[PDB]
Design a protein around this ligand. Structure first.
Ligand SMILES: [K+]
Ligand SMILES: [K+]
Ligand SMILES: [Mg+2]
Ligand SMILES: [Mg+2]
Ligand SMILES: [Mg+2]
Ligand SMILES: [Mg+2]
Ligand SMILES: [Mg+2]
Ligand SMILES: [Mg+2]
Ligand SMILES: [Mg+2]
Ligand SMILES: [Mg+2]
Ligand SMILES: [Mg+2]
Ligand SMILES: [Mg+2]
Ligand SMILES: [Mg+2]
Ligand SMILES: [Mg+2]
Ligand code: NA
Ligand code: NA
Ligand code: NA
Lengths: 50, 49, 203, 117, 61, 53, 83
RNA sequence: GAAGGGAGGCGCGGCCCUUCCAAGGCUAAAUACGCCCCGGGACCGAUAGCGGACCAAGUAGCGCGAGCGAACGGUGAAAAG
RNA sequence: CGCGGCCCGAGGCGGCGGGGGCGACGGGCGGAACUUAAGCAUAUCAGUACGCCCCGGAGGAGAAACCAACCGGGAUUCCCCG
């Protein structure tokens, strides 16, 4: 909604900042086999419950 | 807001899910280390004697 | 001999003088709260016999309890199992009213150590007891060899583990010999020892 | 468990050298009619036996004798048997003063098991 | 911070009550415990008895 | 081992076998089910030693 | 039974054989500052009217033990027959 | 509702014998045992073994909620890919 | 009507204590039913599951208001035996 508490707003803020891929220089520095971050979410499919 | 935590023996899976050791346990780790290999016992002996 | 005179006097509860004094006391207690601190013991000689001393760290509290039997806690008074477990109102508590007073006081004052208790009055709906308590961190207590033993951490909440005289009597520990061989060091411990399946290497 | 019990015994024996691990204890009869004619080891000597050897409970406990003031003698044969036992033990016991040099203490032998079976 | 702590600690060197941040490091359980001499205290009668019969060294055979 | 899940039998009338199932419908518990317990699990109370005169 | 048959029992050994005014004063003083309990006065009246078996029944009902009851009756008989 | 009292594996009353002293308190040892650390095994060997051998498991995901709960091991001597 | 002692109470200040956590072992309470009896109601399962409270490195118990009936033993705990 457009009328939220700051407490709910801060927990949703962290979810957005975390929805990122694995950086390219990290994949090769650590010699990673699996190159996708499976803790990502999509707004049309998820239920954050926050 | 009950003072005590909600724990039930008819589910050991939920106890398993949230309990001591599922977090960092910073203070307990430090005290256990200072005791097994450290000077906590010497300090206690000096303080008591 | 003063305390001998007091003891013989207190053996005559039905005399006119003691009857009058008991009536006065029971009226007085009926106007107060169910747990109350006392300035000094009401019965000095009995308190001395139970271990009380007149120094800093000893305190006395008066406790009131209700008389009669117990009623089960089940909705609408319905037990549902087999017919032998069907009773509601005719039951009797497994512990005495003297032992329940110490539990109430210990719950109310968790920072003190319970010692003993004694009877002081009854009136037909209540009984009154007095409980002796010790402050384990007062220096006079901590530096006295005669009472030091109660400063140990194993003396924490003695009444909650049936270790006072009344709890010990309810556990059956005032008896020895024939009739008492299945209850030491506790009922469950004896039951466990008598039902263990020992499987030795060279059976 | 066997190994652990032996280790504890050895440590304790080392801590009190050269005193023996066990104390001298009386000779008593087995109770019922089925074991009437044999003896075993008892708890402690009575005060009459100690008076027979002229000793006190404090001294007896000092030189390693077990004392049981709860037990009462029921006949003179028991008293005689246990007085003789005490006399033998006293004949065979040696005391070291705080003035003895360390060497002769090292020469002492520490007894094993029951004192006199 | 180290300099400030040293100064403050020198300020309360010999007082009866010092700030709780300077008291010796122990656990809760060992803080709330009897000292060693308090555990060894005996009533006078037992003291007298235990002095007239001290432990002695002896050997058998 | 094999008994830490929650599984109950569906009845007849759904066109499936009558063994216990997990919430999604996965078979459980039986010794012929993947992840189940042993039919007769081994125990330490077996007699390991023997006596000789 | 309860004992083993033996015509010469205990013939091998020789056996050994084992084995307040201030209280009365204190009791007498307390008896003056207090009387007798209500159930003792009833027993005294019964003893005064010459009804001994009635007194024993009453005391036994009150005390619950026959030996204690007879002791109590003997104790109280002085205050009844002394008149 | 008391003064000497208790016990002796069938009750009541009487007389003996044998044993002990309740209604106050303290006390080491020999005994039990998970987490965590160390050692071993005629144990399992990736649908087995713990639900969980995989840089992210009580994780992803499901349910208003109490709860439920997976799948996924292997290039080569050297990436010389 | 004022003020001193004792007694019984009230408000504040200082210094010390308490509270909560721990799928084992330990103590105290409350307390089932499935099941067996080829049915079932006393009995059994079981003084168990589970709920509540309380310590410790162990706990609890403990120096006879004991056993016994003998040519007697002698605080408590734990093992073997029936
Ligand atoms: K699985
Ligand atoms: K039962
Ligand atoms: Mg105790
Ligand atoms: Mg499996
Ligand atoms: Mg008999
Ligand atoms: Mg112990
Ligand atoms: Mg697997
Ligand atoms: Mg305050
Ligand atoms: Mg069953
Ligand atoms: Mg049936
Ligand atoms: Mg059937
Ligand atoms: Mg049926
Ligand atoms: Mg049963
Ligand atoms: Mg203890
Ligand atoms: Na394979
Ligand atoms: Na608590
Ligand atoms: Na602890």
């Amino acid at each position: 909604s457009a009328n939220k508490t700051l407490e709910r707003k801060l927990r949703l803020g962290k979810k957005i900042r975390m929805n990122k891929n694995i950086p390219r220089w990290v994949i090769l520095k650590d010699k990673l086999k699996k190159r996708w971050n499976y803790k990502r979410h999509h707004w049309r499919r998820s239920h954050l419950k926050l | 807001p009950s003072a005590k935590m909600r724990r039930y023996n008819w589910s050991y899976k939920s106890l398993r899910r949230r309990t001591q050791g599922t977090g960092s346990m910073s203070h307990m780790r430090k005290v256990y280390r200072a005791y097994n290999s450290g000077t906590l016992k010497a300090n206690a002996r000096k303080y008591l004697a | 001999g003063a305390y001998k005179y007091v003891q013989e006097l207190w053996r005559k509860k039905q005399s006119e003088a003691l009857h009058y004094l008991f009536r006065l006391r029971t009226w007085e207690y009926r106007q107060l709260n169910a747990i109350k601190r006392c300035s000094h013991p009401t019965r000095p000689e009995k308190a001395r016999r139970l271990g009380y001393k007149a120094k800093r760290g000893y305190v006395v509290y008066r406790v009131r309890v209700r008389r009669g039997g117990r009623k089960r806690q089940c909705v609408h008074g319905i037990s549902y199992g087999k017919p032998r477990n069907i009773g509601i109102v005719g039951l009797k508590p497994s512990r005495s009213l003297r032992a329940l007073a110490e539990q109430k006081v210990g719950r109310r004052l968790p920072s003190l150590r319970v010692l003993n208790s004694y009877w002081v009055a009854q009136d037909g709906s209540y009984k009154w007891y007095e409980v002796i308590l010790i402050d384990p961190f007062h220096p006079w207590i901590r530096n006295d060899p005669k009472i030091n033993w109660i400063c140990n951490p194993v003396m924490k909440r003695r009444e909650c583990r049936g270790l006072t005289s009344a709890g010990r009597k309810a556990r059956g520990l005032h008896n020895k010999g024939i009739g008492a061989m299945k209850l030491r060091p506790s009922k469950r411990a004896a039951w466990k020892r008598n039902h263990t399946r020992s499987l030795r290497r060279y059976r | 468990r066997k190994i652990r019990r032996r280790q504890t015994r050895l440590q304790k024996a080392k801590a009190i050298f050269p005193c023996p691990l066990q104390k001298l204890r009386p000779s008593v009869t087995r109770c019922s009619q089925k074991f009437n004619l044999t003896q075993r080891i008892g708890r402690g000597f009575t005060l009459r036996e100690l008076q027979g050897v002229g000793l006190s409970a404090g001294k007896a406990r000092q030189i390693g004798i077990a004392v049981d003031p709860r037990r009462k003698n029921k006949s003179e044969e028991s008293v005689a048997r246990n007085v003789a036992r005490l006399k033998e033990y006293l004949s065979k016991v040696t005391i070291f003063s705080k003035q003895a040099k360390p060497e002769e203490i090292q020469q002492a032998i520490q007894h094993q098991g029951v004192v006199m079976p | 911070n180290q300099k400030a702590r040293d100064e403050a600690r020198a300020a309360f060197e010999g007082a009866k009550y010092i700030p709780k941040t300077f008291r010796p490091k122990l656990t809760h359980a060992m803080r709330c415990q009897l000292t060693d001499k308090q555990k060894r205290l005996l009533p006078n009668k037992v003291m007298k008895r235990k002095l007239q019969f001290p432990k002695l060294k002896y050997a058998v055979k | 081992a094999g008994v830490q899940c929650t599984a109950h039998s569906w009845g007849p009338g759904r066109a499936v076998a009558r063994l216990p199932r997990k919430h999604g419908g996965i078979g459980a518990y039986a010794n012929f089910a993947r992840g189940g317990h042993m039919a007769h699990p081994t125990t330490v109370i077996r007699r390991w030693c023997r006596k000789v005169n | 039974p309860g004992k083993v048959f033996n015509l010469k029992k205990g013939g091998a050994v020789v056996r050994i054989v084992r084995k307040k005014p201030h209280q009365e004063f204190v009791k007498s003083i307390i008896q003056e500052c207090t009387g007798m309990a209500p159930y003792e006065m009833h027993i005294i009246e019964l003893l005064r009217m010459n009804k001994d078996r009635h007194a024993l029944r009453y005391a036994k009902k009150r005390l619950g033990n026959i030996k204690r009851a007879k002791a109590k009756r003997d104790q109280l008989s002085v205050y009844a027959r002394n008149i």
